[PDB]
Amino acid sequence: KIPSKETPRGVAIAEPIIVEHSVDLLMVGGGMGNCGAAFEAVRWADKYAPEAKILLVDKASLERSGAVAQGLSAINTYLGDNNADDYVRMVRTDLMGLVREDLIYDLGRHVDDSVHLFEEWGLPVWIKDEHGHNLDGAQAKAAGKSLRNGDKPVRSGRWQIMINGESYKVIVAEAAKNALGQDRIIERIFIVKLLLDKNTPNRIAGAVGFNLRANEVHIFKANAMVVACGGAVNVYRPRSVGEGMGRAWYPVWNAGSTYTMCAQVGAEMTMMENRFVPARFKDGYGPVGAWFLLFKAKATNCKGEDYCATNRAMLKPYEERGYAKGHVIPTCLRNHMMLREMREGRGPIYMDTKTALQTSFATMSPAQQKHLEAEAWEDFLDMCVGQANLWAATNCAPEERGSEIMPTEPYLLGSHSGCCGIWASGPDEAWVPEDYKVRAANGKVYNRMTTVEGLWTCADGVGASGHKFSSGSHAEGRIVGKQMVRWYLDHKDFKPEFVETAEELKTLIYRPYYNYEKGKGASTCPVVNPEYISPKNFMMRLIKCTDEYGGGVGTYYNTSKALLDTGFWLMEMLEEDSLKLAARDLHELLRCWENYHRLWTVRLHMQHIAFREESRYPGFYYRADFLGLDDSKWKCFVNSKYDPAKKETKIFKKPYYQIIPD
Amino acid sequence: PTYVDPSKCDGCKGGEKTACMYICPNDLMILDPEEMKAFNQEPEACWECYSCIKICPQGAITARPYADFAPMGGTCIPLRGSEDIMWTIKFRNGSVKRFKFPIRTTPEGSIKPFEGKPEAGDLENELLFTETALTVPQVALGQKAQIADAETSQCWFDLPCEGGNR
Ligand SMILES: Cc1cc2nc3c(=O)[nH]c(=O)nc-3n(C[C@H](O)[C@H](O)[C@H](O)COP(=O)(O)OP(=O)(O)OC[C@H]3O[C@@H](n4cnc5c(N)ncnc54)[C@H](O)[C@@H]3O)c2cc1C
Ligand code: SF4
Ligand code: SF4
């Protein structure tokens, strides 16, 4: 009855074992990024470094881990007939002008090759038949048509292609597995720290983590590594605060690890001020696109009018400066026109699918009607099942009643329609500026390497180069995978060493366990206890602070220097309080470290928006005290570098080089 | 969020992987070893990705749509085969819609990542092992942005305030 007697329900938690690993190439994460990295690295190692120990570690199991967990309905990056210059041009417009164009171009001339590999591996890809009618992957194979055979995909926009990608991730994880084998892949192990070398300055040396199935602290020594662990979600308070805390657009388990693990160790960060707030179906966040273009269903306010047309004037200052001109509005400016309809109470923003369906069903045959309905529903069943559940629940089959649109709480990501992350290195060509190249102590420049020597990142990891999506994420991993094998061979005789001992690392990882053990006697209830703090409560206290002072949903994405300052004041009592986190079981120890990653990132994101004295992303967030954009003082990137020894962050401007014209 | 049907769940007696517990990307599925029944240990952290619902051999796991905004009665049930997936959507009012989609063209566990493909080439160029040539920007510029920095446009000299030698 008394709560402290009740069983913890997680795995166990007890004094950990400590198991070390000496490895040549480490890979932290197993999403789209590292599954590309592993695939590439093995091939180069099998020829040039077959004795080299390669290891991939993942929080979950590789088969389903990451954003592509329930699969996708589209691949959003595929040139094929398109040139990588208009690719850079489009990503620049969408992300408000300030992007690393060399990284985007470099990502362009590699990306299609991954998509071509995917099909070959078993991914069902949609292809136009001959009379311009859609064929699904299974029947495209049956017909004998493929991307390998250059047959032009279905495509719902210059850059995207349609797929039956429910098993997308498992197909990719399979290729990474068969290249590595269940001997270079250890799953169900969460990495928390990242250690850098005791000897040479600014050089990476290792990583610490823990097993989620048994009490073990893992210490990894390494020569070169990728940290690609996705973006940051649940850093801001969501629109559903009960059980709906799990229904976010981007995967709820993205704890902002990639961002903090590297920033914490001295890597130069970039564009952390950038966020992404998508406009999706209310509460379930399912994709809208298909319903709009397959049936011509539009967004209407309480008056039934098109708010895009009504609020055109809002775009004047931007199009005159060349940011939006002629019905090619950036995604952020699209939901900037949405917000005024909301804050002035002319909601709800409504997709009338009822009347839009009954009109389009008149100009289609009964069998042609089943086909366009089955395409549209697949956008949920292949991409976002939670939404289909909501429609099942609310009696909202599109035939009989429409649905609501709502902009989501901010998400921090670099691979999708955002660009916050880590300052990476350009390829080293004539067309790449010198400031865009890192180049190590040995003088050579390795592609996509951080300013920390020997550390790589990709896909959500690298900032200022958004719109990679599931294909670019893989392609970037491939780029890195090679550079790591290349790095190892140039630094073959390294031997890494840490300033901290294995015991010191172990007592750090399990601190929240000791916190709980030493303080549990104080209370009859394990949660309400003055000695420590629950990870679920830490989670809540943070997302509240961020919502109210960092420009979350509650404040209509609005912030200022004053609001941020109050934020920071609470933020660093929370930083202090994190030292007194508590774990009853292994699952709680996981949350304890994830929420600590969640703090460091969301704080850094705010420190960046505090610095940039303009509102570069209107509709995503506003600086109330600096409402408009300013190309005079702020046409550039905003970078930061954390000092480990001095526990100080230095936020500075970093010049932007225009490469692709227009 | 997801829950387990106790009458269907056997706790995975053979092949000592607990399918649900193994697969969950968010570490939410966990087995009670004595009872040989599983559950979701933290339902409010469920992304409702169906990973565990698909992998369950007994089919014991169903999804109750988020209680704090989704009304009762509605449910989605997959049946993921070797090369295809069948969905059945049961509505609150009793309606039923069914679907069938392709998931994979090739057999499970068959990908030979390197078989047939070129061997590793030059460690010093930007070519991946499967590539032979790469595009170079149509027209490439090196135009630095340059930022004014100075907090004033003010000038108190008579002469432009440009060649600021001191
Ligand atoms: C709802 C939504 C819809 C999307 N639709 C499309 C689309 O239509 N087309 C398209 O091309 N792309 C789409 N994407 C975007 C695409 O999924 C991402 O760009 C891509 O998955 C990013 O891959 P990643 O490298 O960041 O790794 P992710 O796939 O994000 O996975 C991260 C990996 O890191 C691991 N990890 C996390 N933390 C740790 C830890 N600290 N220690 C060890 N491992 C850790 C996780 O286990 C996971 O395996 C969509 C994404 C979302 C979720
Ligand atoms: S996979 Fe299914 S049968 Fe096995 S333990 Fe989980 S819920 Fe029970
Ligand atoms: S639906 Fe997905 S995230 Fe939720 S418990 Fe099942 S496997 Fe985990």
Side-chain angles (χ1 to χ4, degrees):
Chain A
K1 215 166 201 295
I2 180 187
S4 69
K5 270 298 287 177
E6 288 169 30
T7 274
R9 88 166 48 177
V11 166
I13 213 161
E15 256 290 316
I17 282 303
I18 306 148
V19 34
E20 287 158 297
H21 296 100
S22 69
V23 96
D24 298 296
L25 276 76
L26 189 69
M27 301 192 180
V28 183
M32 292 282 89
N34 287 3
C35 275
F39 170 73
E40 190 74 17
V42 165
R43 185 56 161 189
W44 287 85
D46 283 4
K47 190 69 181 285
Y48 295 94
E51 85 299 334
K53 279 179 272 192
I54 303 159
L55 215 92
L56 196 138
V57 290
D58 196 68
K59 154 178 153 64
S61 60
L62 205 66
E63 194 187 329
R64 282 285 181 193
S65 64
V68 197
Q70 57 187 345
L72 307 172
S73 67
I75 283 169
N76 294 358
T77 304
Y78 190 61
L79 272 60
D81 280 14
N82 284 284
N83 68 110
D85 307 66
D86 304 331
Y87 175 63
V88 175
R89 269 186 279 268
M90 95 81 177
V91 183
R92 185 167 58 193
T93 302
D94 207 279
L95 292 171
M96 299 295 293
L98 298 168
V99 291
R100 288 258 266 105
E101 303 176 55
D102 64 328
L103 302 179
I104 297 167
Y105 191 94
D106 186 38
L107 200 265
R109 33 106 133 167
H110 288 286
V111 68
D112 291 16
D113 196 35
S114 294
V115 192
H116 287 126
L117 283 165
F118 297 153
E119 188 177 35
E120 187 199 289
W121 294 343
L123 183 65
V125 185
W126 295 29
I127 287 138
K128 290 281 158 177
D129 60 352
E130 58 218 46
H131 302 106
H133 304 302
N134 298 341
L135 291 178
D136 73 59
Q139 59 202 21
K141 207 86 169 296
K145 300 197 159 67
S146 66
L147 286 174
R148 311 280 293 192
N149 207 245
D151 279 296
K152 284 268 90 184
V154 157
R155 174 154 286 166
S156 51
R158 184 151 289 102
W159 312 103
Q160 60 254 235
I161 71 158
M162 293 302 297
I163 47 157
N164 303 299
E166 182 280 325
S167 284
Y168 198 167
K169 180 74 216 282
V170 9
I171 287 156
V172 184
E174 178 154 315
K177 181 187 180 286
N178 302 343
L180 284 165
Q182 51 138 312
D183 284 306
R184 284 138 132 200
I185 307 161
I186 169 144
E187 299 173 324
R188 209 50 79 167
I189 175 275
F190 183 89
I191 296 293
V192 6
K193 198 81 172 76
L194 285 201
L195 312 162
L196 72 181
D197 194 50
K198 184 184 76 185
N199 302 329
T200 41
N202 183 63
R203 200 193 173 318
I204 213 274
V208 210
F210 60 96
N211 188 340
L212 280 65
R213 298 286 169 256
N215 287 116
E216 291 158 17
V217 172
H218 283 68
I219 287 89
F220 300 91
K221 264 166 268 66
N223 194 320
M225 64 168 78
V226 271
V227 180
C229 297
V233 357
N234 272 181
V235 289
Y236 281 88
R237 177 153 64 188
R239 294 202 166 269
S240 309
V241 297
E243 277 182 358
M245 205 102 67
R247 188 71 246 117
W249 175 75
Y250 217 57
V252 68
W253 50 76
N254 278 193
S257 293
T258 309
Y259 297 128
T260 64
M261 277 167 56
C262 305
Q264 196 188 201
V265 90
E268 198 172 316
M269 298 297 101
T270 188
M271 294 319 286
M272 288 300 292
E273 61 266 35
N274 174 95
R275 54 169 63 167
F276 173 57
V277 10
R280 304 301 160 106
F281 285 131
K282 179 88 148 50
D283 305 340
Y285 305 123
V288 185
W291 305 102
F292 168 62
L293 99 312
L294 284 185
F295 301 112
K296 253 70 187 183
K298 54 199 80 183
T300 41
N301 66 10
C302 65
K303 283 168 184 168
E305 58 202 11
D306 172 26
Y307 69 90
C308 288
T310 312
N311 304 54
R312 274 193 323 273
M314 302 191 77
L315 303 171
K316 282 287 283 290
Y318 300 95
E319 59 190 18
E320 276 169 12
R321 289 164 73 87
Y323 282 96
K325 271 288 158 63
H327 56 258
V328 181
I329 342 278
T331 313
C332 79
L333 281 172
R334 290 193 171 271
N335 81 141
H336 165 75
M337 299 193 296
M338 186 159 63
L339 258 38
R340 276 232 276 91
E341 248 44 55
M342 291 170 66
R343 64 164 62 86
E344 283 153 60
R346 290 186 301 275
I349 304 305
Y350 198 67
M351 271 266 301
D352 182 11
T353 69
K354 169 73 177 281
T355 59
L357 279 201
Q358 72 187 50
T359 55
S360 75
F361 291 156
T363 51
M364 309 183 325
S365 71
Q368 189 189 159
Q369 183 172 160
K370 284 285 99 177
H371 288 302
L372 282 197
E373 202 210 60
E375 283 186 30
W377 274 85
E378 200 184 353
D379 254 279
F380 294 157
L381 287 333
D382 272 15
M383 175 105 87
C384 170
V385 200
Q387 182 72 51
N389 261 320
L390 186 60
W391 277 15
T394 54
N395 287 322
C396 286
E399 314 97 67
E400 35 190 312
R401 36 176 50 260
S403 293
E404 191 178 337
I405 311 291
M406 200 108 293
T408 326
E409 76 280 350
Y411 301 119
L412 296 174
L413 37 76
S415 70
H416 207 92
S417 210
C419 79
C420 58
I422 304 158
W423 183 264
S425 190
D428 187 12
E429 320 274 290
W431 56 269
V432 182
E434 185 48 39
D435 290 334
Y436 283 12
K437 307 176 184 192
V438 167
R439 83 199 326 148
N442 77 83
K444 296 216 294 284
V445 18
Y446 305 82
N447 202 190
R448 265 41 137 87
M449 198 184 78
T450 69
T451 65
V452 164
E453 194 156 284
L455 165 67
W456 278 267
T457 190
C458 69
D460 271 343
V462 322
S465 56
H467 298 250
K468 308 175 193 301
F469 301 102
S470 61
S471 295
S473 298
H474 189 83
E476 254 216 319
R478 293 193 64 187
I479 287 165
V480 176
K482 180 188 163 160
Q483 294 301 307
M484 281 189 287
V485 170
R486 170 176 183 236
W487 173 271
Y488 165 66
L489 295 166
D490 312 352
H491 303 74
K492 178 172 267 283
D493 323 308
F494 175 48
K495 194 198 179 189
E497 284 148 38
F498 313 129
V499 65
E500 43 268 308
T501 51
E503 312 280 35
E504 282 163 6
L505 294 171
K506 156 265 189 197
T507 66
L508 167 56
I509 301 305
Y510 272 63
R511 162 154 70 228
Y513 169 65
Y514 302 137
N515 278 333
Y516 174 69
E517 216 67 15
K518 135 260 279 292
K520 63 156 166 283
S523 177
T524 54
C525 156
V527 187
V528 187
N529 186 307
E531 294 311 309
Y532 48 72
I533 183 156
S534 166
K536 304 152 78 75
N537 277 130
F538 192 86
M539 227 284 210
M540 213 70 57
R541 188 174 148 199
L542 173 69
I543 63 163
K544 182 181 180 299
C545 167
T546 66
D547 182 75
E548 295 178 339
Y549 301 111
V553 283
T555 184
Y556 283 131
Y557 309 92
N558 211 105
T559 191
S560 64
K561 192 211 200 304
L563 248 38
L564 285 156
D565 277 323
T566 312
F568 295 125
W569 168 70
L570 294 157
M571 285 258 173
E572 62 93 46
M573 296 179 90
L574 195 59
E575 228 289 319
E576 292 174 336
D577 284 14
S578 67
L579 290 165
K580 296 152 175 277
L581 269 154
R584 300 185 73 197
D585 60 55
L586 272 174
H587 181 75
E588 273 190 46
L589 182 70
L590 174 73
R591 297 275 169 258
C592 273
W593 281 109
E594 284 185 322
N595 300 150
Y596 181 75
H597 290 163
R598 282 191 176 103
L599 206 191
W600 220 106
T601 295
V602 77
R603 184 176 57 215
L604 182 49
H605 164 62
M606 287 182 192
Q607 288 170 12
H608 272 234
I609 70 183
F611 192 84
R612 189 185 281 280
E613 295 182 321
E614 44 149 31
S615 306
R616 175 59 49 171
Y617 308 94
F620 276 10
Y621 76 88
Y622 309 98
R623 281 281 297 258
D625 53 347
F626 294 97
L627 228 311
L629 41 51
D630 172 53
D631 283 326
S632 315
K633 276 159 124 70
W634 298 99
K635 184 74 159 196
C636 57
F637 310 113
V638 174
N639 286 23
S640 65
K641 190 195 261 66
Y642 177 77
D643 197 293
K646 221 175 75 184
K647 296 182 183 198
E648 217 94 38
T649 329
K650 204 72 71 76
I651 309 100
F652 51 90
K653 302 186 191 184
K654 196 75 176 288
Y656 150 86
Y657 288 84
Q658 193 196 350
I659 306 173
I660 308 310
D662 279 306
Chain B
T2 55
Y3 72 98
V4 174
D5 195 322
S7 67
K8 291 277 189 74
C9 177
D10 71 318
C12 299
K13 215 182 220 298
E16 70 265 51
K17 68 149 191 172
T18 311
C20 59
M21 183 172 174
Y22 158 79
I23 207 70
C24 182
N26 206 20
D27 186 54
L28 307 175
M29 298 312 293
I30 184 157
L31 175 71
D32 178 318
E34 200 204 298
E35 290 292 299
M36 293 301 290
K37 306 272 165 275
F39 68 95
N40 189 325
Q41 69 171 317
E42 196 198 348
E44 72 277 351
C46 189
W47 197 50
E48 220 165 65
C49 68
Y50 276 61
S51 295
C52 62
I53 297 166
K54 286 162 188 178
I55 204 162
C56 181
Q58 302 299 332
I61 314 168
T62 337
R64 183 186 65 38
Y66 306 85
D68 76 305
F69 67 73
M72 305 165 69
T75 188
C76 304
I77 306 166
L79 224 164
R80 189 178 166 273
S82 65
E83 47 160 283
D84 32 39
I85 192 163
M86 289 168 286
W87 287 98
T88 175
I89 313 297
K90 215 285 202 79
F91 281 80
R92 178 170 172 97
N93 61 30
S95 295
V96 179
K97 317 190 96 180
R98 300 165 198 274
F99 301 102
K100 204 202 296 292
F101 308 121
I103 60 157
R104 201 173 169 173
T105 77
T106 68
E108 195 266 290
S110 72
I111 295 159
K112 278 160 261 63
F114 313 117
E115 197 210 68
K117 305 303 166 65
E119 291 198 28
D122 194 6
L123 271 161
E124 225 64 16
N125 63 17
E126 289 287 329
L127 287 175
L128 274 28
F129 77 98
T130 48
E131 301 170 329
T132 52
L134 299 166
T135 340
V136 168
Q138 285 271 327
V139 182
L141 284 67
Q143 297 209 259
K144 200 186 188 189
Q146 291 274 136
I147 45 276
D149 203 12
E151 55 85 25
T152 40
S153 61
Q154 285 191 16
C155 179
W156 295 105
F157 266 105
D158 285 337
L159 301 169
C161 295
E162 221 289 328
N165 178 102
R166 58 172 181 171

